[PDB]
């Protein structure tokens, strides 16, 4: 069956997102360090400018997934449905533009489904479409909507994203989010493992 709302919320705590173009260091290493530091979920997001393509992209994907497995953390794929199914990913994340959430939900069985939402109505449609969690943002220039969502009684697991750092994360959890997702705060950090750990501890505190 679909993931439980309870387990989904726990997984979103420290949601690390990364592609090879998000770090000048070794990508596979930054991922291993983030997992070792305490990231609770990882999203493979290989896109934008100068991202890996073809076989090179697939190898990074398989290595990133292997690291998630050994660390016991779910592996989530951004956008690519075929890849998610081929690699047997733990789930997929999609945006509003190039994807029909309802059709994706039907194609992935009980895999975790994430959807980027930007409006109150998009949050509601994502849940209705079958999403297990919604990614809301950008929160910062890289929480009022989050507060508004919870105020109405919408209980879908929510993860904040967009310019989140160890110093502005707390307000996102207090607003009602179930976790924070980040890219550079960890991928570009001088000590990725340590950055992940701080986040891990910070979010624990505010959820507790």
Swiss-Prot record:
GO terms for cellular component: cytoplasm. It catalyses: 2-[(2R,5Z)-2-carboxy-4-methylthiazol-5(2H)-ylidene]ethyl phosphate + 4-amino-2-methyl-5-(diphosphooxymethyl)pyrimidine + 2 H(+) = thiamine phosphate + CO2 + diphosphate; 2-(2-carboxy-4-methylthiazol-5-yl)ethyl phosphate + 4-amino-2-methyl-5-(diphosphooxymethyl)pyrimidine + 2 H(+) = thiamine phosphate + CO2 + diphosphate; 4-methyl-5-(2-phosphooxyethyl)-thiazole + 4-amino-2-methyl-5-(diphosphooxymethyl)pyrimidine + H(+) = thiamine phosphate + diphosphate. HAMAP family: TMP_synthase. It is an enzyme of class 2 (transferase). Belongs to the thiamine-phosphate synthase family. Its EC number is 2.5.1.3. Induction: Is weakly repressed by THZ and not at all by thiamine. It comes from Bacillus subtilis (strain 168). This is Thiamine-phosphate synthase. One of its GO terms (biological process) is thiamine diphosphate biosynthetic process. The gene is thiE. Changing residue 116 to A: 8000-fold reduction in catalytic activity. 4-amino-2-methyl-5-(diphosphooxymethyl)pyrimidine binds at residues 43-47, 78, 116.
């Amino acid at each position: 069956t679909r993931i439980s709302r309870e387990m989904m919320k726990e997984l979103l705590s420290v949601y690390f997102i990364m592609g090879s173009n998000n770090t000048k260091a070794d990508p596979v290493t930054v991922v291993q360090k983030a997992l070792k530091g305490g990231a609770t979920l990882y999203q493979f997001r290989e896109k934008g400018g100068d991202a890996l393509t073809g076989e090179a992209r697939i190898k990074f994907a398989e290595k990133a997934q292997a690291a998630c497995r050994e660390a016991g953390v779910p592996f989530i794929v951004n956008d690519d449905v075929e890849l998610a199914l081929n690699l047997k990913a733990d789930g997929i994340h999609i945006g509003q533009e190039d994807a029909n959430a309802k059709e994706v939900r039907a194609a992935i069985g009980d895999m975790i489904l994430g959807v980027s939402a930007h409006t109150m109505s998009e949050v509601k449609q994502a849940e209705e479409d079958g999403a297990d969690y919604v990614g809301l943002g950008p929160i910062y220039p890289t929480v009022s909507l989050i507060e508004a969502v919870r105020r109405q009684g919408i209980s879908i697991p929510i993860v904040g994203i967009g310019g989140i750092t160890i110093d502005n994360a707390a307000p996102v959890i207090q607003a009602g989010a179930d976790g924070v997702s980040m890219i550079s705060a960890i991928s570009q950090a001088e000590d990725p493992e340590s950055a992940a750990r701080k986040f891990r501890e910070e979010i624990q505190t505010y959820k507790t």
